[PDB]
Amino acid sequence: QAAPNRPNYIGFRDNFIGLMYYNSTGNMGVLAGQASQLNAVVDLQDRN
Amino acid sequence: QKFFAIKNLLLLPGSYTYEWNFRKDVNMILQSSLGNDLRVDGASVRFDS
């Protein structure tokens, strides 16, 4: 007696909640003016 | 950094292009201890990054 395997849907997350290391102070982006290159996006690890 | 004119240089603010060329031949950059010629018996590979 065979049967169909339980269906896996698979796909990307809602508004891509993932791909985008938001909120990892270590691997966090930047938007600082070029010839200052200090930073403009200071990200904590509290907010999500 | 091994150059004498850059090894201890102090930089000023700005954007600079730092470029260098590496060796990936085993016989040059992998000292043995009998000198059998690595380059005939095997070696290095990447420089993955």
Curated annotation (Swiss-Prot), chain A:
Q: What induces it?
A: Expressed in the late phase of the viral replicative cycle.
* Localisation per UniProt entry: Virion; Host nucleus
Q: What is stated as this protein's family in its record?
A: Belongs to the adenoviridae hexon protein family.
| General remark | All late proteins expressed from the major late promoter are produced by alternative splicing and alternative polyadenylation of the same gene giving rise to non-overlapping ORFs. A leader sequence is present in the N-terminus of all these mRNAs and is recognized by the viral shutoff protein to provide expression although conventional translation via ribosome scanning from the cap has been shut off in the host cell.
- Biological role stated in the UniProt entry: Major capsid protein that self-associates to form 240 hexon trimers, each in the shape of a hexagon, building most of the pseudo T=25 capsid. Assembled into trimeric units with the help of the chaperone shutoff protein. Transported by pre-protein VI to the nucleus where it associates with other structural proteins to form an empty capsid. Might be involved, through its interaction with host dyneins, in the intracellular microtubule-dependent transport of incoming viral capsid to the nucleus.
Indicate the quaternary assembly: Homotrimer. Interacts with the capsid vertex protein; this interaction binds the peripentonal hexons to the neighboring penton base. Interacts with the hexon-linking protein; this interaction tethers the hexons surrounding the penton to those situated in the central plate of the facet. Interacts with the hexon-interlacing protein; this interaction lashes the hexons together. Interacts with host dyneins DYNC1LI1 and DYNC1I2; this interaction might be involved in intracellular microtubule-dependent transport of incoming viral capsid.
What is the official name of this protein in its record?
Hexon protein
Gene symbol?
A: L3
